[PDB]
């Protein structure tokens, strides 16, 4: 009876506690990330925290290059995150082989969401404690942000945020868009979109960032790439000469 809390079957209230507790695990890393769409690019910002001095900072990341055009940032423990990344990469490569064209960001998102839905329905599989944010500049849809969770749910966003202080980032972004009346950052260069992204990250969290406190991924026509400490530093300086 009380096992309706150990595996994924309904509780008398029609709930799936394991999926709920999986959502809880997504915040275990205490990291926040946000994504925004530019005029022709998609940017993703994510806090980077390296506590141990014995760690090689270069190997600590939660952003992944799924394919030449798709990037994915994960909110949740790293092992489940890497499990999700490997699967997404294999899925992306197979799709190209079978259908002759690059897997679109939203399709990969639906596919990973469906896999998630399965862990939600079959008892022997546990949900992954992660939230996945996919980004790219789709050849048909343009800048795109699609996010999936432990419930198998997924949807597209104008912009989005994830993590412990998700709500604060979200309202901040909501406000900006109620003001701008448009669904994207009307900037021609991705560098400025990255700056916008970081600027609002700061405002919302009320915190300052050094070049080693952030992690950035950018998606443009035919390519998704992550920024280096120095590329970021150049970003932080620019925003500094405005405040």
């Amino acid at each position: 009876a009380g096992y309706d809390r150990h595996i994924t079957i309904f509780s008398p209230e029609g709930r799936l506690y394991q999926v709920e507790y999986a959502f809880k695990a997504t915040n275990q890393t205490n990291i926040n990330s946000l994504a925004v769409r530019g005029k022709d690019c998609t940017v993703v910002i994510s806090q980077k925290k390296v506590p141990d001095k014995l760690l090689d900072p270069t190997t600590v990341s939660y952003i992944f290059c799924i394919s030449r055009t798709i990037g994915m940032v994960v909110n949740g423990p790293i092992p489940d995150a890497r499990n999700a990344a490997l699967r997404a990469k294999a899925e992306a490569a197979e799709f190209r082989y079978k259908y002759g064209y690059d897997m679109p960001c939203d399709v990969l998102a639906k596919r990973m969401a469906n896999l998630s839905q399965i862990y939600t329905q079959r008892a022997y599989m546990r949900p992954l404690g992660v939230i996945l944010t996919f980004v790219s500049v789709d050849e048909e849809l343009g800048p795109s942000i699609y996010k999936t969770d432990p419930a198998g749910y997924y949807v597209g966003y104008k912009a989005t945020a994830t993590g412990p202080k998700q709500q604060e980032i979200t309202t901040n972004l909501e406000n900006h868009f109620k003001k701008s009346k448009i669904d994207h950052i009307n900037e021609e260069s991705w560098e400025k979109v990255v700056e916008f992204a970081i600027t609002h990250m700061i405002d919302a969290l009320g915190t300052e960032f050094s070049k080693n406190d952030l992690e950035v991924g950018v998606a443009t026509k035919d390519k998704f790439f992550t920024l280096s400490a120095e590329n970021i530093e150049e970003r932080l300086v620019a925003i500094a000469e405005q405040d």
């Binding site: 082989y97 079978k98 259908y99 002759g100 064209y101 679109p104 939203d106 399709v107 639906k110 048909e140």
Partner: peptide, 20 residues
């Protein structure tokens, strides 16, 4: 596939599926 991806079918897809 069209229904699944919410996109118009591409000739290169029919071609890849047929050839394989």
């Amino acid at each position: 596939h069209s229904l699944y991806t919410s996109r118009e079918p591409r000739v290169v897809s029919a071609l890849q599926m047929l050839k394989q």
